[PDB]
Amino acid sequence: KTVFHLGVTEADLNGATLAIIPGDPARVQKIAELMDNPVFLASHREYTVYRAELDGQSVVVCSTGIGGPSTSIAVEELAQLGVRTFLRVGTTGAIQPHVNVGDMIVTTGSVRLDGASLHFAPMEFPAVPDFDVATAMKAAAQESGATVHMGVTASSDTFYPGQERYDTFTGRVVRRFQGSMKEWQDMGVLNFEMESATLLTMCASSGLKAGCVAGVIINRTQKEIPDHATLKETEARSIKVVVEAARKMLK
Amino acid sequence: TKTVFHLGVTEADLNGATLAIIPGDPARVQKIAELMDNPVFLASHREYTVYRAELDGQSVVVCSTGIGGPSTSIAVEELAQLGVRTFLRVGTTGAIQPHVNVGDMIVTTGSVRLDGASLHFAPMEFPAVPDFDVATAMKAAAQESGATVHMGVTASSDTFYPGQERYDTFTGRVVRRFQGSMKEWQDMGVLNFEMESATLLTMCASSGLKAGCVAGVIINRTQKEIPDHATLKETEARSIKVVVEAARKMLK
Amino acid sequence: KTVFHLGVTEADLNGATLAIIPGDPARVQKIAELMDNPVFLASHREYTVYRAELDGQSVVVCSTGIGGPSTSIAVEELAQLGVRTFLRVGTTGAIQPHVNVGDMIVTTGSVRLDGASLHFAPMEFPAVPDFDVATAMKAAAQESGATVHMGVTASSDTFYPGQERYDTFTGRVVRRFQGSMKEWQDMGVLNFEMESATLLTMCASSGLKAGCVAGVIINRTQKEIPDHATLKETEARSIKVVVEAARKMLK
Amino acid sequence: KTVFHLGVTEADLNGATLAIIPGDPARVQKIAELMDNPVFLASHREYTVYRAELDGQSVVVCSTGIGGPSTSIAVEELAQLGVRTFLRVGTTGAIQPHVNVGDMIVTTGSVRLDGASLHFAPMEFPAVPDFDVATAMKAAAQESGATVHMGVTASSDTFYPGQERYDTFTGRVVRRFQGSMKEWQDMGVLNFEMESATLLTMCASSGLKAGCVAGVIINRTQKEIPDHATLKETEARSIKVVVEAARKMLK
Amino acid sequence: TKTVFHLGVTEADLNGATLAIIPGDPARVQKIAELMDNPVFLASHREYTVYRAELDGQSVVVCSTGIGGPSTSIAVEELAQLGVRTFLRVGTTGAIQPHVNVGDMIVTTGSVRLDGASLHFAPMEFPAVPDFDVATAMKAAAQESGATVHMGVTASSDTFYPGQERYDTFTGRVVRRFQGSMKEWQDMGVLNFEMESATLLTMCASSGLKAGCVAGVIINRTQKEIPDHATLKETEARSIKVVVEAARKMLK
Amino acid sequence: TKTVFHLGVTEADLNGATLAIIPGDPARVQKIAELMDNPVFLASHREYTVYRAELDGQSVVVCSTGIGGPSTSIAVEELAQLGVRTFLRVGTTGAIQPHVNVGDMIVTTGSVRLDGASLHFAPMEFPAVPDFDVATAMKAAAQESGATVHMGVTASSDTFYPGQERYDTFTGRVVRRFQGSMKEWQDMGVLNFEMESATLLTMCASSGLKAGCVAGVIINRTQKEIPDHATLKETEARSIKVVVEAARKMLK
Numbered sequence A, C, D: 001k002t003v004f005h006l007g008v009t010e011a012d013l014n015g016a017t018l019a020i021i022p023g024d025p026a027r028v029q030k031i032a033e034l035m036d037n038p039v040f041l042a043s044h045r046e047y048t049v050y051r052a053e054l055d056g057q058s059v060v061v062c063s064t065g066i067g068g069p070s071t072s073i074a075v076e077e078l079a080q081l082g083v084r085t086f087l088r089v090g091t092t093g094a095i096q097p098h099v100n101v102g103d104m105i106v107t108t109g110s111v112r113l114d115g116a117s118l119h120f121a122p123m124e125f126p127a128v129p130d131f132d133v134a135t136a137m138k139a140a141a142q143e144s145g146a147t148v149h150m151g152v153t154a155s156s157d158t159f160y161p162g163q164e165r166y167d168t169f170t171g172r173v174v175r176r177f178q179g180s181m182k183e184w185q186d187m188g189v190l191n192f193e194m195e196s197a198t199l200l201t202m203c204a205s206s207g208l209k210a211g212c213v214a215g216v217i218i219n220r221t222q223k224e225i226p227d228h229a230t231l232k233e234t235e236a237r238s239i240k241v242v243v244e245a246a247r248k249m250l251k
Numbered sequence B, E, F: 001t002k003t004v005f006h007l008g009v010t011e012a013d014l015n016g017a018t019l020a021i022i023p024g025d026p027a028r029v030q031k032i033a034e035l036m037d038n039p040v041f042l043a044s045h046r047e048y049t050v051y052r053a054e055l056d057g058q059s060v061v062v063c064s065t066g067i068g069g070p071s072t073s074i075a076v077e078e079l080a081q082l083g084v085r086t087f088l089r090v091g092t093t094g095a096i097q098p099h100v101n102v103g104d105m106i107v108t109t110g111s112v113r114l115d116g117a118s119l120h121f122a123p124m125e126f127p128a129v130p131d132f133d134v135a136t137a138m139k140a141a142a143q144e145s146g147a148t149v150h151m152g153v154t155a156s157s158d159t160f161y162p163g164q165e166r167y168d169t170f171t172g173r174v175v176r177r178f179q180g181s182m183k184e185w186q187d188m189g190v191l192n193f194e195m196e197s198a199t200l201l202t203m204c205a206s207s208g209l210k211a212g213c214v215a216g217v218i219i220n221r222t223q224k225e226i227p228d229h230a231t232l233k234e235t236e237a238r239s240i241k242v243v244v245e246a247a248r249k250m251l252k
């Protein structure tokens, strides 16, 4: 039995029950090399898959691509192969002025501005992380020296209009999303990203443990397009954090 | 200065309290207050009975909510007008998972919004989640008490009967939306039903207020055994001792 | 057989098939004493229950608490015990300038700004009273000398944002409710309250007869304070009216 | 000076402020001839318009066509010319077993299974008649010796799937409507027709007085397609009732 | 042998027709039929006037719909019961784009579902799109008549007044949903407003029936000019010539 | 001047292209580019591999989208910022009708919006429709290739598993919304499932961009036979030859 998109078998995972799921296929090897005995397993489409060992236990690293749809495939196929815990690491845009580029955010719940979450549970259901994963992520983030924020994340199926960006081809935002960034800001929402609503709803409704930690690459109080110089330092810290969160989950 | 419209108390009456314990039943208010020091009756109007007491030397409010989001939302608003910023809900609940037993404790990590009042604060997409510090304090208090504690999702309904898929009713029928719903929530891992957490959590999380919910299981919708009087009595007492210890953990 | 919340049995109601349902537990005795042989039955939570006799027929008086959820419990449990007709008497805020403090309103339909109504019928279903109850309420209100208005009531799950109040802790109102008071005013809606949508929808979809009559205790458009003798008279007049409406319903 | 669709002027109405609005253009002359001085005014599309006199006062009779969209045009354009009261007469299918062919139904509220109502008020708003019109309709129906039922009407934008008819080209009903007739029956809904939700919602939200009376031409616990034998007698009774209800509304 | 309840015709009355032309106005039925051979009146009941005619030897129905999806849905259903499988809608419309002139033709490639009856056939997610062969035939016929033809999205409303964002009305009010809507559709590239296409196209695309819509522009909501009476007369005549030639292409 | 944030290309890199071919799989980009003249690798970042090539003398972009509306929406936006106005989507699909075989081609005439990202461009009422010229070009290219071609409605899902009503999954459960949904779409005449067309078509139709979708059938949900490797290889090669010939037809 080889899963349809990831191109791996259960035997390939050497008993892993925890996965680290970054978005970018290029981040997969980078995470895996922070652990022991990393091995490349497969690459198909946006899905690059490695295994490694953390404190003697097998751990998967698998990219998701951007968005809930491609995420949902990776999570499902990994769960078919025995993975039960999913630690998302990603980048994010802050919508509160006091959050700085380089800070870390651990999501306590997501605003479901996606479609895939609805393929698992009706809108009433909360897009919430597993409490142990969130706790582990907070501790790992703090222990790294990062400034960490816990709170609500707005999770959008688009980068552009659903995050109320106006520097676009049309410069238009549909009625639903006009004024939405200020509305979420006033409601205390910390940040925008694109996968947590799907991930957290899928997992919380399916017997899987999940959480999301993200490095802040932009503050929307300043600009819409992230600076490229900020990215590499923020990403290095984020992946150290998520591996330490994985360590806490396995202990 | 001003007296809020429903609760019948002033800011001065609260003696600087910034934390409230909010049970549903007005008769539980005095019982909670008497677990603390120097309890003082402030007011009773409608479903709202209000006491103050001292916990490690700090004033705490105890205020009942009544049943349901609407009455809850009034109490939370009016307490926040008077300086309360942290709200600890303690209440009874029905478990829907076979592994959860009468007498266990549940700390809600998020609520299924089967209510209306939450939508008066945030659109449905918004998560009905607790403040992380409150949830952490509640888990710690509940576990330290020696209880069996479950962290997870709660289904929060505007009705006791059809929205909890009860059929033992005058009409014996449930609107389409709720037919099969208990099994759906069970399959999704939802732990329990109650009637205030969706409103409370959504209101607070979208309004700069810290909230959480801990609940004592008084029925399991899947078990035929009837719980004995002693176990229910004990569960009620343990729930309020836990929420007072969670309040202690929140005080700064 | 004792119902779960109200703490009464069918025998306790002495054959009553009609209930008067105010919101405030303290008003229950005040209504019951306008009838013969009032007797306290139970008080639990927001539910205070009396029985009395009207023209020789037993009648229940039972408070509901604030909001549809607590109302829905009381109506269900009374219906399990044989009650088939429910007369609601309450306070309200008028939103039309021609309606004065002191006037009565008989609801002909409610705007469903609640949640519990949806636990009985989908939103398309009309929150309307039983025609005989509304007719009896109108006649009783007119016979008391009050100016009475028949019309639509906006029935909200909140006192604050859902009634478009801004003098609150946050001072915000969610998008759905911004501009809503003016919208209802322009649509001819008379007043706000917090239980009629649940009550009327529940009863109209469950074979129970229900209606609502309410005393105007504020006008959201008028500046002045009403004097005490008027407020006191309005409360007394409201409960005199509901009892006379009950008399009309019983033969 | 003529309205866009109806082809009539204010002068043509000769002071009428009340309209009788049947669906079928052929019922217009029949209604007008129950009154004094009937005069043909115009016929365009589904809109046939007459005037007549009732107790010395002008009344307009104007067909609507089938459905909310065509109804909404007629109501609007008549209101532009000074009409304020709208009496709907139509045919209907009963869904309760006890409601027989030839009975009359006066709608106390409509299930909004239409689209046009939403162009006047959001779904929460009740599709409710004016209380004076409903009272006049009940009185006219009862005084005529008819068997009369007061209650909720399911008002559908289709004759076929939205009324859960299966004897159709596809034999399919979309998920929303599968099982819907039994749900309405269990909820105590009396009947199906196609215009009341739009009419009542439009009028109740726009300062216009409206009500709906209908003659039962089929009982849906029996069959789907009305028998032709009984149509003429039921329609004659219905229009006699609606004209009397208009008499009761004249000031 | 049955006579359909509203249209008052039998299958035999249609002489084997599998295509219908469906204008809105009963008075246009005879006008369309007389562009074909051997037109014969079949029935008139309510808004439904029904003729039969022959086009290149093949029977065709012409049946009015009335205004709106509800009455349209009845005519389509009852014709389909009698063997009709292809439905060509010809109607009037209001353009909302400045580059579309009074007298141009529009062939709808999809409709904005601002109706209710479409929902009685398919949930809102389903696209209100024409059959591709019908749309192709309509485009070709329109071009061959010398008209300027636009292919694009049509906003299909259950009202003439608020749902087309008209304020020159008895109340002068437009419900929140429709406030600003005309500009929103304009900015989204929508060409025009009418009142039947959403129902027609959704019903047919979800029921195994082929449908399309072609319209002549009788007003432009952005232009202050008032068109000639001769231009309007010519537009009506051209629209029905076009729909008959589109039918010919479908029957070839 | 600017380099777009996700795609990592500039306007100058596109050498004047106003048309893009947008497959799903980054690995298909080079294969499509090599069917044209002078293919040039431009960038690869995340799921976005970008090439340029020349078709009859004109520059054409080829850019992968990844799986799903969200990643598609980014590519489309960023290409539009760089001057692209016409988007030709080629992808794989699962047929749900028995008459549609593996190796056949589908050209979508409208999409069932079972996605979220479409709603970020237009409300649900708006049709997820292709540009008529692109759909016409795709039908012609597909038919001219000798393939069997189906025009019709496509169900476009944000999931591969529950939203396509697959039960052989980790949980084996499908949420209520999607229980029975494949049969409902089948009965409504829907041809196929994929995961990007609703977003793409809605975004473009509401933004002044021309788009269409063509897909090769790689599986039929109603067939038990597994297609052989040669048939799948032929299908993938035919799909990309077809999309390139469709692009040729669109060039002006």
Ligand SMILES: Nc1ccn([C@@H]2O[C@H](CO)[C@@H](O)[C@H]2O)c(=O)n1
Pocket (backbone or CB within 6 Å): A023, A065, A066, A067, A090, A091, A092, A093, A094, A159, A163, A192, A193, A194, A195, A217, A218
């Ligand atoms: N301002 C930002 C910054 C980052 N992200 C996240 O990173 C990817 C899109 O750039 C997506 O994976 C998304 O989660 C975002 O959405 N918004």
Ligand SMILES: Nc1ccn([C@@H]2O[C@H](CO)[C@@H](O)[C@H]2O)c(=O)n1
Pocket (backbone or CB within 6 Å): B024, B066, B067, B068, B091, B092, B093, B094, B095, B160, B164, B193, B194, B195, B196, B218, B219, C005
């Ligand atoms: N099975 C159960 C058990 C408890 N509750 C809680 O108790 C009150 C209503 O009885 C409400 O406060 C509600 O939260 C419930 O709803 N359902």
Ligand SMILES: Nc1ccn([C@@H]2O[C@H](CO)[C@@H](O)[C@H]2O)c(=O)n1
Pocket (backbone or CB within 6 Å): C023, C065, C066, C067, C090, C091, C092, C093, C094, C159, C192, C193, C194, C195, C217, C218
């Ligand atoms: N302006 C007003 C006036 C009165 N009410 C009624 O009083 C209770 C809340 O105060 C509720 O029970 C409600 O019936 C209200 O909601 N709004």
Ligand SMILES: Nc1ccn([C@@H]2O[C@H](CO)[C@@H](O)[C@H]2O)c(=O)n1
Pocket (backbone or CB within 6 Å): D023, D065, D066, D067, D090, D091, D092, D093, D094, D159, D192, D193, D194, D195, D217, D218
């Ligand atoms: N079973 C029935 C009977 C009657 N009607 C009403 O009559 C017309 C449709 O035949 C429509 O005008 C509609 O109001 C209906 O909808 N359903």
Ligand SMILES: Nc1ccn([C@@H]2O[C@H](CO)[C@@H](O)[C@H]2O)c(=O)n1
Pocket (backbone or CB within 6 Å): D005, E024, E066, E067, E068, E091, E092, E093, E094, E095, E160, E193, E194, E195, E196, E218, E219
């Ligand atoms: N601006 C316009 C122009 C025309 N239409 C068409 O007009 C009929 C009702 O007037 C309807 O049948 C509709 O097709 C419209 O709705 N809006």
Ligand SMILES: Nc1ccn([C@@H]2O[C@H](CO)[C@@H](O)[C@H]2O)c(=O)n1
Pocket (backbone or CB within 6 Å): F024, F066, F067, F068, F091, F092, F093, F094, F095, F160, F193, F194, F195, F196, F218, F219
């Ligand atoms: N049965 C099928 C076949 C194909 N697809 C398409 O292939 C990619 C994911 O497999 C996605 O691009 C999707 O469009 C699908 O979703 N379902």
Ligand SMILES: Nc1ccnc(=O)[nH]1
Pocket (backbone or CB within 6 Å): A166, A171
């Ligand atoms: N660029 C913008 C256009 C419209 N609204 C905005 O807030 N910004």
Ligand SMILES: [Cl-]
Pocket (backbone or CB within 6 Å): B023, B024, B025, B028, B090, B091, B092
């Ligand atoms: Cl309690």
Ligand SMILES: [Cl-]
Pocket (backbone or CB within 6 Å): B102, B218, B219, B220, B221, B223, B224, B225, B226, B227
């Ligand atoms: Cl139990």
Ligand SMILES: [Cl-]
Pocket (backbone or CB within 6 Å): C022, C023, C024, C027, C089, C090, C091
């Ligand atoms: Cl009261």
Ligand SMILES: [Cl-]
Pocket (backbone or CB within 6 Å): E023, E024, E025, E028, E090, E091, E092
């Ligand atoms: Cl026409």
Ligand SMILES: [Cl-]
Pocket (backbone or CB within 6 Å): E102, E218, E219, E220, E221, E223, E224, E225, E226, E227
């Ligand atoms: Cl014009």
Ligand SMILES: [Cl-]
Pocket (backbone or CB within 6 Å): F023, F024, F025, F028, F090, F091, F092
């Ligand atoms: Cl591909």
Ligand SMILES: [K+]
Pocket (backbone or CB within 6 Å): A046, A064, A065, A066, A067, A070, F047, F065, F066, F067, F068, F071
């Ligand atoms: K992706």
Ligand SMILES: [K+]
Pocket (backbone or CB within 6 Å): B047, B065, B066, B067, B068, B071, C046, C064, C065, C066, C067, C070
């Ligand atoms: K209450």
Ligand SMILES: [K+]
Pocket (backbone or CB within 6 Å): D046, D064, D065, D066, D067, D070, E047, E065, E066, E067, E068, E071
């Ligand atoms: K009509």
